Design a protein around this ligand. Structure first.
Ligand SMILES: CC(=O)N[C@H](C(=O)N[C@@H](Cc1ccccc1)C[C@H](O)[C@H](Cc1ccccc1)NC(=O)[C@@H]1CN(c2cccc(C(C)=O)c2)C(=O)O1)C(C)C
Lengths: 99, 99
């Protein structure tokens, strides 16, 4: 599809049995999801943005479906205010910026 | 142009005769530039990000040329880690997400 930017580019994603709304975010290197209790190994990490840093849990090779496009990659879990789909997954679903 | 997302979508912008690199950021409501001098009045404002809130200076009706496309809009100036072009200006240059 084509998504205009008049409003936040929010889309439905699927991860496990949780459907969620997430921002398609070209300004995020990494995908960062609201707190959720995913299974498996993870490692602690700190990610920074406007305002400072937050502590997250890095989970690897997690399947996520974004608007019915399949992806699989690293997902950071922590106290983000908004679910963020970052470039690591945006490339996998063939997302570009165009003007 | 079409811009893929294997790298950060950084572009040269021109503002007040100065060239800067800035991030095309669909996950940002607002345009936020690192500390710099801009002419005219500004209003103190606060904005929030992944790590918390910061204080910025709001400049209205500021021309920025982004990849040779003209915008004139609100530009916030403050302690952002990177220069960010947000949706307020991305829409002005006809930018969309496509996959
Ligand atoms: C309300 C709003 O739109 N806030 C924006 C914002 O912070 N947007 C965030 C997501 C968000 C958070 C809270 C509320 C709403 C929306 C997403 C941005 O794309 C943001 C841009 C950015 C990029 C780099 C540094 C600071 C800010 N992205 C991120 O926060 C993360 C941080 N990040 C990153 C990666 C590596 C190093 C660093 C450093 C050194 O700070 C940051 C990254 O790639 O994406 C501002 C930029 C205006």
């Amino acid at each position: 599809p084509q998504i205009t930017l008049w409003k936040r580019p929010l889309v439905t994603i699927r991860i496990g049995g949780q459907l969620k709304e997430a921002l398609l975010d070209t300004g995020a290197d990494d995908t960062v999801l609201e707190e959720m209790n995913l299974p498996g190994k993870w490692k602690p990490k700190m990610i920074g943005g406007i305002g400072g840093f937050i502590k997250v849990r890095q989970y690897d090779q997690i399947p996520i479906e974004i608007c019915g496009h399949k992806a699989i990659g690293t997902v950071l879990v922590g106290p983000t205010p908004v679910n963020i789909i970052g470039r690591n997954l945006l490339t996998q679903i063939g997302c570009t910026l165009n003007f």
